[PDB]
Design a protein around this ligand. Structure first.
Ligand SMILES: COc1cccc(Cl)c1NC(=O)N1CC[C@H](C(N)=O)C1
Ligand SMILES: [Zn+2]
Length: 139
C-alpha cells in the first residue's frame, strides 16, 4: 500500500484504488496501473521533473529504504495476476531490488522529489510506475 499526496490529488496504484478513490476520480490508466483522485486537504509531496535513473525506494516487506538504479520509463511485459490479465504495462521502470505484492505503493524518490510508486516485481526485481510526465499534478 501507499499513495503520493500532491496539491489536491492522491496518486495510487489503480489495482489498489478504494471506492472513495473511484467516487472522486480525476484520471486512471489501466495500461500504467495508475489512478488519481481528488482530495479536500492540501498534499504533503513534491514531484520530480528530471531524467534521474538512481533513487531510493521504500520496501514495506523489509520496513527499509533501498538505493536503486532503474531503467527509463518503457513498455514492459507483466505476467497475469489476480488484478490484470497478462499484458504490456507502459511508463514502467525496472530495477534489481526486493519486492513482494504488498510492496505496491512504496515511493521511489530522487534528489528532485517523487519519481514514482512500486507497481510490479518478483525474483529480485522491482518495477515502478513513473509519474514525472504528469505535469498537471502540480498545476
Ligand atoms: C510488487 O509487485 C510484485 C512483487 C512480487 C511478485 C509479484 Cl507477482 C508482484 N506483482 C504484483 O503483485 N502485481 C499486482 C498487479 C501489478 C501490476 N502492475 O500489474 C503486479
Ligand atoms: Zn531527479
Amino acid at each position: 500500500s501507499g499513495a503520493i499526496y500532491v496539491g489536491n490529488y492522491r496518486v495510487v496504484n489503480r489495482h489498489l484504488a478504494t471506492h472513495n478513490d473511484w467516487a472522486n476520480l480525476v484520471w486512471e490508466d489501466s495500461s500504467r496501473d495508475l489512478l488519481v483522485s481528488s482530495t479536500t486537504a492540501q498534499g504533503c509531496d513534491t514531484i520530480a521533473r528530471c531524467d534521474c535513473q538512481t533513487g531510493v525506494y521504500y520496501c514495506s516487506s523489509r520496513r527499509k529504504h533501498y538505493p536503486v538504479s532503474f531503467s527509463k520509463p518503457s513498455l514492459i511485459f507483466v505476467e497475469a495476476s489476480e488484478y490484470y490479465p497478462a499484458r504490456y504495462q507502459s511508463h514502467l521502470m525496472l530495477a534489481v531490488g526486493h519486492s513482494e505484492p504488498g510492496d505496491c505503493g512504496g515511493i521511489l524518490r530522487c534528489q528532485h522529489g517523487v519519481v514514482g510508486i512500486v507497481s510490479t516485481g518478483g525474483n529480485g526485481l522491482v518495477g515502478f510506475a513513473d509519474v514525472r510526465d504528469l505535469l498537471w499534478l502540480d498545476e
